[PDB]
């Protein structure tokens, strides 16, 4: 039923991209085709290859055959991708996918969420996280916007939640900006009733997986 | 790209539109064609498989067809929530690979103009304790997707220290952007007020913040 790629990250040029997809809700040994598919910046889609769960047989996109290996691990119910001698051309979002059940009321195939792998000689850098509390005049309105600034990180991506994911309505996380320094910043904002600023606690949850760092920031008065 | 697609196709709401996919005898002519839809920020979703089958949960306004070396996705009763990218997919015998089309961007015409909603944040106290100050200007829910951002400090233009994103589409087909003015503590303390000015379809919304 559900597929989850491993964490996003940086790979240095010439080194080896290594990903895993953890499967739950079904067996990796079932008679299905487990694919790796990537989407480059610019939105082009490319099929990398697949492994058949029942036999371990593989097919690879022929230009990649000398660089790629796909494998299955039964103990962990997962499959994996290794792409060696990687270059900036391999920067892309990588999806694990399984073909769908062949019955008339099938839901379709099943895709992971995708994982950004960026190939660069630049170095990883975790963000600073700052609270954005509304100016005085905004608290006077009926609703107020409060947020978190995630400044100066590399590479993409960072995710933001609010109050551990228990705050959905009014949340807007903006796409990052790529600054002249070569580092990213983004902002997340949630709009909330102005009355609530005394009662309730607002905490934003920033995850920058490429630097293994997570920050839960309280937005104060 | 072994499967050629029109880069852009547009239709009026309620109308019927057809997205084309032109191939060869080494792919569409002999092997099944699949159609995928991709909404902003999300993985591709299977709309059609095996030339013309539709999975459960895909609206019946979508239908697929194939003939010779060409395939087609057909959308009836066109809706704004059909704006997405659409890719065809097939297997190519001569390359020995599953391949995707170049992609068609579908726009639903006649959507109403919407002015940008604007929020401006001053610097945090704790960024100021590090002797810095980032003003953040968040801009959302405008249509069409073009906006211009200019900053002012008191009266005058600020021509340095500004980074501004390209607009990007939201889930509701309107657009978002953001702009950042990076100062030091002393610069922030120096002026009396700062302003983010957002121009959209010939009118501007401006927000102001003060130390």
């Amino acid at each position: 039923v559900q597929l989850q790629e491993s964490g996003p990250g940086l790979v240095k040029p010439s080194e080896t991209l290594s990903l895993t997809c953890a499967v739950t809700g079904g067996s990796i040994s079932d008679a299905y085709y487990w694919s790796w598919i990537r989407q480059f910046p610019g939105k082009r889609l490319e099929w990398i290859g697949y492994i058949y769960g029942s036999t371990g047989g593989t097919r690879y996109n022929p230009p990649l055959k000398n660089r790629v290996s796909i494998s299955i691990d039964t103990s962990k119910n997962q499959f994996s991708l290794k792409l060696r001698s990687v270059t900036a051309a391999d920067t892309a979002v990588y999806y694990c996918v399984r073909d769908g059940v062949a019955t008339i009321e099938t839901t379709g195939d099943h895709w992971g969420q995708g994982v950004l792998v960026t190939v660069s000689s630049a170095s990883t850098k975790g963000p600073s996280v700052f609270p954005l509390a509304p100016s005085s005049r905004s608290t006077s309105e009926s609703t107020a916007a409060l947020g978190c600034l995630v400044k100066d990180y590399f590479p993409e991506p960072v995710t933001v939640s609010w109050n551990s994911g228990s705050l959905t309505s009014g949340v807007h996380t903006f796409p990052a900006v790529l600054q002249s320094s070569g580092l990213y910043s983004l902002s997340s904002v949630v709009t909330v009733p102005s009355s609530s600023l005394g009662t309730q606690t607002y905490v934003c949850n920033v995850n920058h997986k490429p630097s293994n760092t997570k920050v839960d920031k309280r937005v104060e008065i | 790209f072994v499967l050629a697609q029109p880069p852009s196709v547009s239709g009026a709401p309620g109308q019927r539109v057809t997205l084309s996919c032109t191939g060869s005898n080494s792919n569409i002519g002999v092997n099944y064609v699949q159609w995928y839809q991709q909404l902003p920020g999300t993985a591709p979703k299977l709309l059609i498989y095996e030339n013309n089958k539709r999975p459960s949960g895909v609206s019946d306004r979508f239908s697929g067809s194939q003939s010779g070396t060409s395939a087609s996705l057909t959308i009836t009763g066109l809706q704004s929530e059909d704006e997405a990218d659409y890719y065809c997919q097939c297997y190519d015998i001569s390359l020995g690979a599953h391949v995707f089309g170049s992609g068609t961007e579908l726009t639903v015409l006649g959507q109403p103009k919407a002015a940008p909603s604007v929020t401006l944040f001053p610097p945090s106290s704790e960024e100021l304790q590090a002797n810095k100050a980032t003003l953040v200007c968040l801009i959302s829910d405008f249509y069409p997707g073009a906006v211009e951002v200019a900053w002012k400090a008191d009266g005058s233009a600020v021509n340095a220290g500004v980074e501004t994103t390209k607009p990007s589409k939201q889930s509701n087909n309107k657009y978002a952007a953001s702009s950042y003015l990076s100062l030091t503590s002393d610069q922030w303390k120096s002026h009396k007020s700062y302003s983010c000015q957002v121009t959209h379809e010939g009118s501007t919304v401006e927000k102001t913040v003060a130390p």
Partner: peptide
């Protein structure tokens, strides 16, 4: 295939 799978 329902998606990307067996060639035919």
């Amino acid at each position: 295939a329902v998606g990307i799978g067996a060639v035919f």
